[PDB]
Every structure is written in C-alpha cells, then in structure tokens.
C-alpha cells in the first residue's frame, strides 16, 4: 500500500540510577510527529511536525494521560518480566513495543500490527488475524494469558481498524503537502581509482522522500547483487534521505556498468552511467 502510522515505545530499567525511563514516538510513514520522555522536566507529549500543532488541548491531554500511565505501567512490566525469567534485580533490561496500521493506495486497511520485544528479542505479537497471539516462550505465555483474560486482542482489533485508520487519514489530509508528496532523488555517479587496474563507481541518491528506494548496479545488464556495496539509508536532517551503491570495476570497463534507481517520486525508473 502507500501509507502507515506506527508508535514506538522503549522502556529501560537502570538499577541504582533511578526509576525506569519510558520514551514514546509516533510516525506517519517516515515522518515523526510526536514524542514523550519520562525523563523530561514536566513530561508531556510534544509536537514534532507542523501539521500536528493544530490539534486541540483535549488531544494533547489525552496523549499525556496515556503516556504518563504508560510510564507507571511499564515499570510494573519490567518488574514482571524480570521475575518470569528469574533474573537479578541488578541488571538493566528493555521492553520495546511497536504497533499501528497500514493503508493501501485505496485508503482501506491492509493490515494491523502489534509486537513487543524483551532485550531486543521477540517476546509477544498480535497475529495478522488481530484475534490471537504468538508468545515466544513460556515467559511470554504468562503475558498472553493476562491479555486473553483482559480481552486485549478485541480492544486492539477495534483500535487498529477504527481509531488508528481514522487518525491516520486525518493526518494525511492535514499534512498532505508533505506526507502525500514524494520527492524524487537527485542522482549521479562518481569514480575513484583503487589501483592501476580497478576503480570504484558509486551511485548516489540524495534528497528523496519517502525512504523507500532501490539502487542497483548491472554489468552487461546482469545484476551485480553479490558485488554491490550498499550503505544503509540515512536521514539528511531536512526530512529527506541519502543512499549510495558502489561496485569495483576493471579500469577501461566502466561503460559496461549501469546504475538503476527506482523511487516513487520518479516519473519513470532511472538508468545512469559514469560521465567522464
């Protein structure tokens, strides 16, 4: 599909250094729109994109009430998981949670999501049916039963199909000039000899939004999958992203190589070559 909303929660214990810290951020695609940190002076949910500022006091109070309760709730959960795993009170641990909804180009719900991890490894996840759970081990099963008893899955299904899609669509309209605008990448190829017999061709993509992009090198039209070095897509700081793909080629053979770029902001897919 084309759009999604996601909330990311991180709860971290720090024995001997105060109570566990809770941080929450909200994103619509690759655009962050809200934040909350329990370590702030006057913890409150703050705006992170201009289009959210127009929301009323009730919106901000409701978010803050929820996030302040989350801070308490997660302190209790970190205590609970420590016990489910028979761990010492001396170690630091982290519970992460990520949930939200995906919309297709038609605007209707493609699928819902809800997953949690403990120390960076899967713990419990709502299944695609939005009705059952997948617990990773006997400890997660304890959490599963509590949730089944509280009819959590039913409330999650209702949120994901109701409120989540409704707010997402509201945000996509209010922030349409940016959220619904794909900025194509500016591309170019550089050359750096690596020896008297080989050189590096690096294909650049700059200033694009959203982050989703495909950069590939071909030699005689054949994809150089195992021979292409790809860097992780990185943020520029102005909402856009950067990325590059490099291949080391024999000197005098650079014209046999073509870089192909696909991005949704592009009228049609690009093919580039080094221009001496």
């Amino acid at each position: 599909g084309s759009h999604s909303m996601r909330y990311f929660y991180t709860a971290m214990s720090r024995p001997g250094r105060g109570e566990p810290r809770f941080i929450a951020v909200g994103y619509v695609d690759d655009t962050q729109f809200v934040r909350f940190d329990s370590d702030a002076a006057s913890p409150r949910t703050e705006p992170r994109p201009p289009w959210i500022e127009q929301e009323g006091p009730e919106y901000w109070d409701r978010n803050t009430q929820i996030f302040k309760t989350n801070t308490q709730t997660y302190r209790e959960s970190l205590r609970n998981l420590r016990g489910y795993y028979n761990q010492s009170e001396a170690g630091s641990h982290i519970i992460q949670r990520m949930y939200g909804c995906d919309l297709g180009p038609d605007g209707r719900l493609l699928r819902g999501h809800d997953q949690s991890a403990y120390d960076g490894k899967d713990y419990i996840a709502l299944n695609e049916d939005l009705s059952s759970w997948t617990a990773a081990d006997t400890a997660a099963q304890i959490t599963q039963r509590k949730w089944e008893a509280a009819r959590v899955a039913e409330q999650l299904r209702a949120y994901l199909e109701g409120l989540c899609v409704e707010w997402l669509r509201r945000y996509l309209e209010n922030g349409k000039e940016t959220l619904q605008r794909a900025d194509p990448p500016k591309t170019h190829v550089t050359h750096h000899p690596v020896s008297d017999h080989e050189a590096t061709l690096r294909c650049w993509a700059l200033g694009f939004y959203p982050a989703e992009i495909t950069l590939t090198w071909q030699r005689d039209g054949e994809d150089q999958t195992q021979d292409t070095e790809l860097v992780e897509t990185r943020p520029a700081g102005d909402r856009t992203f950067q990325k590059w793909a490099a291949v080391v080629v024999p000197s005098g053979e650079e014209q046999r190589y073509t870089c192909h770029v696909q991005h949704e902001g592009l009228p049609k897919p690009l093919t580039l070559r080094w221009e001496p």
Binding site: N70, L81, T143, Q155
Partner: peptide, 8 residues
C-alpha cells in the same frame, strides 16, 4: 491517539 495502556 495512542493505544490504551496495559501491563505485561
């Protein structure tokens, strides 16, 4: 708005 809080 975000999801309702819950304990693990």
């Amino acid at each position: 708005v975000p999801l309702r809080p819950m304990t693990y």
